[PDB]
Design a protein around this ligand. Structure first.
Ligand code: 1T2
Ligand code: 1T2
Lengths: 170, 170
């Protein structure tokens, strides 16, 4: 009995599969304006945060004050700026894997018998299953950032700078 | 690997658990008006259709023309009238188990390797898991109507008349 299997398939089938095909076109359109205004570029991939403690807050800034909402990507998703010593070090479309909230709610529902360690195992299994799904899916369109709570903004920036290095080298 | 386990838990945790506690109060409020206007009563339970073929249409009437949308239950869900030879034989809050659509989408996604028989097994497992969950959940608030495609309206009416007989006998 592994709820993560169905949660991952549901998340992909009913959300990621629908959002990812148009994502890059939407970001290219946004970046024509963003490059004109700020001489930079929003990253092209959807970054999905997978906190293995299943703690999804209302506002990303609550998890790290160097992660601040910047703007809405039209047609919607949220663009966040990533700060270093008060400077914009990076920009990306960032959001939590919402099925993790189901795992958290289950661990607080006493009739489930779903312990805290159960939640952790299932959150790990959720990450591995989603990676397997995305690996075969019609991409290079999104990145899973799984972490056990360290700076979350620094971990995102790690990925954003690696994405740019891949962009310009291959 | 059984996607139905996580689909059922997700459906309960993120939807049924939220809707069921207030349902009866909402229907009692509606029925004060409905009894005044039509001298009858809407049934008190949420009826969840579980077509084992995972065929969830846009309009319930497409599945059976004796099932017609009647009105919105405020605060929302849809109230349907059940017809027999053109007469209102019953009234209830009726809706499909939407996770079944995830099963259907998976069977049409060739990289899943999720065959038609896989879909059937998982849809059955989804019904049994949901029943187990509801059995322990804090109720008598909803009824699962699983069926393999016969009149769907007659099957719903079967349940509605059994509910009323239970209401007046115990
Ligand atoms: C149909 S689409 O391809 O998904 C699509 C995707 C992105 C955008 C978009 O960024 N618009 C922007 C508008 C506007 O629209 O007035 O003003 C802007 C000012 C600054 C920036 Cl940085 C962007 C915009 C528009 C359409
Ligand atoms: C806050 S609540 O308990 O969820 C709640 C639940 C149900 C209703 C409700 O049926 N209203 C109705 C109103 C109105 O509201 O004007 O007119 C009506 C005419 C006919 C019927 Cl048959 C019902 C209503 C209202 C509140």
């Amino acid at each position: 009995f592994n709820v993560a299997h169905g949660l991952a398939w549901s998340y992909y089938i009913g959300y990621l599969r629908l959002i990812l095909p148009e994502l890059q076109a939407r970001i290219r359109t946004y970046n024509q304006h963003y490059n004109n205004l700020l001489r930079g570029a929003v990253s092209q991939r959807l970054y999905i945060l997978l906190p293995l403690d299943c703690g999804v807050p209302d506002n990303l800034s609550m998890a790290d004050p160097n992660i601040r909402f910047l703007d809405k990507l039209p047609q919607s998703n949220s663009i966040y700026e990533l700060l270093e010593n008060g400077q914009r070090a990076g920009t990306c479309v960032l959001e939590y894997a919402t099925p993790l909230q189901t795992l958290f709610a289950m661990s607080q529902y006493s009739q489930a018998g779903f312990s805290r360690e159960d939640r952790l195992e299932q959150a790990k299994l959720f990450c591995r299953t989603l990676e397997d799904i995305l690996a075969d899916a019609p991409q290079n369109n999104c990145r899973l950032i799984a972490y056990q709570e360290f700076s979350l903004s620094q971990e995102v920036l790690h990925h954003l700078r690696q994405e740019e290095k891949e962009e310009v080298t291959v």
